[PDB]
Design a protein around this ligand. Structure first.
Ligand SMILES: CCN(CCO)C(=O)Nc1cc(O[C@@H](C)C(F)(F)F)c(C(=O)Nc2c(F)cccc2Cl)cc1F
Ligand SMILES: Cc1cc2nc3c(=O)[nH]c(=O)nc-3n(C[C@H](O)[C@H](O)[C@H](O)COP(=O)(O)O)c2cc1C
Ligand SMILES: O=C(O)c1cc(=O)[nH]c(=O)[nH]1
Length: 355
């Protein structure tokens, strides 16, 4: 462990989190990242993964929700992420829920949020990506892809049409798109929706045609997961992001704010996510790439998700407590563990628990 990792985790982040409300802290983080104001890990070949029609120089991505409006993409690559996912972006601008809407549970290394899809909207984000479109084309070619998580407006009558709007507007600027699914006449509704998203995707010109992934929560029933796996295979959905935050409250949470409404992220989600990855990988016969997310704050965490079936991983909440150096830390620890377990690279470890 580096000097920076320890200073940030032991001193700087606790101090900053004690001086700032959580929403301000997140806002500040976006502004510092967008300005490239970052502590200074060369990515080995062993971290490279090929999936989703793309080289990923390393398999550690930034999860959706950090950079909701696509303001900090370049700084997120500078921070050392192998890929960046922006959003969720809704079609029209919207404010999201009233404040306060994000909460730290430092004793649990957890966050609860109820942002409510606060979004600048498609049009603002489209112009923002357009301004750096060619810079991104070089980044993607260099193994640093961009994802866009697409949302729906609060008062949308037609969810499918909102996502279709997102495909049309941001699909041409993305390497991959993500649509968040909640509980599924439910399987048929999901089919109808994903059909429409794929049809819209397929209507884009070849060079501007993104992969489509479905992101799930960890709170689905067995039946919901079976149905999602079935639909995903039937329709040729390109991948799964496993998982979003949980509405559960695992026994053992200590933070005072544990009973705040919202999604819980960070360490208490970790194993629930991993086991979701495991089930989705088995239900799709290892044929659907999975991006694994939820409580990754170490190499071990990352490797457990990979071995359970993830091709790639994302983290977000760990940044709250470790700051930017966590990115280098996870990569360094993952590489070391890959070597200790006999894997030539990340690719060999994907789904290794199932074999
Ligand atoms: C719960 C509130 N949430 C959102 C969930 O995570 C939050 O607090 N998040 C959160 C904060 C961060 O830092 C707050 C303290 C800052 F910005 F005020 F220092 C950073 C972070 O990486 N900061 C950072 C940076 F961008 C560039 C250079 C140095 C630093 Cl230290 C990331 C985060 F995800
Ligand atoms: C403050 C906050 C905002 C989030 N916003 C989004 C979002 O807009 N769309 C989305 O798909 N996921 C969102 N997430 C979920 C993350 O993408 C991720 O799935 C979840 O936090 C689990 O990963 P983590 O434990 O590493 O944070 C958000 C998470 C947090 C903590
Ligand atoms: O904006 C939010 O509230 C949000 C969206 C999402 O997909 N996940 C989450 O935890 N929060």
């Amino acid at each position: 462990a580096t000097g920076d990792e320890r200073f940030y985790a032991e001193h700087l982040m606790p101090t900053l989190q004690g001086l700032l409300d959580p929403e301000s802290a997140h806002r500040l983080a976006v502004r510092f990242t967008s300005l490239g104001l970052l502590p200074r890990f060369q990515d080995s070949d062993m971290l490279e993964v090929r999936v989703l029609g793309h080289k990923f120089r390393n398999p550690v991505g930034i999860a959706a929700g950090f950079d909701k409006h696509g303001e900090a993409v370049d700084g997120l690559y500078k921070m050392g992420f192998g890929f960046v996912e922006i959003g969720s972006v809704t079609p029209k601008p919207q404010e999201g829920n009233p404040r306060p809407r994000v909460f730290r549970l430092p004793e649990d290394q957890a966050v609860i949020n109820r942002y409510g899809f606060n979004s600048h909207g498609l049009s603002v984000v489209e112009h923002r990506l357009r301004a750096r479109q060619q810079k991104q084309a070089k980044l993607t070619e260099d193994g640093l892809p961009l994802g866009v998580n697409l949302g729906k407006n609060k008062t949308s009558v037609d969810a499918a049409e909102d996502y279709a709007e997102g495909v049309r507007v941001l699909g041409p600027l993305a390497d991959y798109l993500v649509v968040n699914v909640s509980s599924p006449q439910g399987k048929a509704e999901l089919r109808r929706l994903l059909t429409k998203v794929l049809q819209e995707r397929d209507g884009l010109r070849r060079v501007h045609r993104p992969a489509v992934l479905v992101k799930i929560a960890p709170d689905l029933t067995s039946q919901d997961k079976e149905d999602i796996a079935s639909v995903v295979k039937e329709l040729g959905i390109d991948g799964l992001i496993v998982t979003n935050t949980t509405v559960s409250r695992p026994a053992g949470l200590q933070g005072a704010l544990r009973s705040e409404t919202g999604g819980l992220s960070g360490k208490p989600l970790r194993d629930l996510s991993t086991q979701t990855i495991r089930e989705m990988y088995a239900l799709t016969q290892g044929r659907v790439p999975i991006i694994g997310v939820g409580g990754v704050s170490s190499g071990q965490d990352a490797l457990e998700k990979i071995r359970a079936g993830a091709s790639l991983v994302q983290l977000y909440t760990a940044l709250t407590f470790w700051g930017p150096p966590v990115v280098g830390k996870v990569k360094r620890e993952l590489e070391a563990l890959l070597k200790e377990q006999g894997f030539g690279g990340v690719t060999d470890a994907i789904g290794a628990d199932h074999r």
